[PDB]
Amino acid sequence: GSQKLVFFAEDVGSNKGAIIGLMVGGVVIATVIVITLVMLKKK
Amino acid sequence: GSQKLVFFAEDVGSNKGAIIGLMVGGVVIATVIVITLVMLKKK
């Protein structure tokens, strides 16, 4: 559920990258496109 | 240790939504802004 999910990282450590990278990349990329659009429409 | 860790989800069940909602919302919102920008610059 929580702690156990972490244990998997100790044995594998090749899964957390997918989940984290998904939430992180999405939020980052998302904002990137937003700021770019605002600046484009700004001027 | 294992099973118990899962039980926590049955009691709360308000955590998985954060992770999933983060990856899902990020990917969705991200694309949304992208398509909107392409259309705005298109015309």
Question: Which residues in chain A have their CB less than 8 angstroms from residue B33's CB?
Answer: 30, 33-34, 37
CB A26 within 8 A of CB B30: yes
Domain B1-43 architecture: Helix non-globular (6.10)
Interface touch B25/A25, C-beta < 8 Å: no
* A5 closest CA partner among B39, B21, B24, B15: B15
CA B1, B13, B26, A41 torsion-angle sign = negative
Calculate the CA A15 to chain-centre distance: 13
**Last residue before each break in chain B (C–N > 2.5 Å):** none
CB B16 within 8 A of CB B9: yes
CB B22 within 8 A of CB A21: no
Q: Where are the alpha helices (DSSP H) in chain A?
A: 3-11, 16-42
Give residue limits of the domains in chain B.
1-43
Pick the residue of B7, B8, B15, B23 with the most A CBs within 10 A to test the interface with A by mutation. Answer: B23
Calculate the CA A40 to chain-centre distance: 25
Experimental technique, in short, is NMR
Tokens describing residue B32: 């949304």
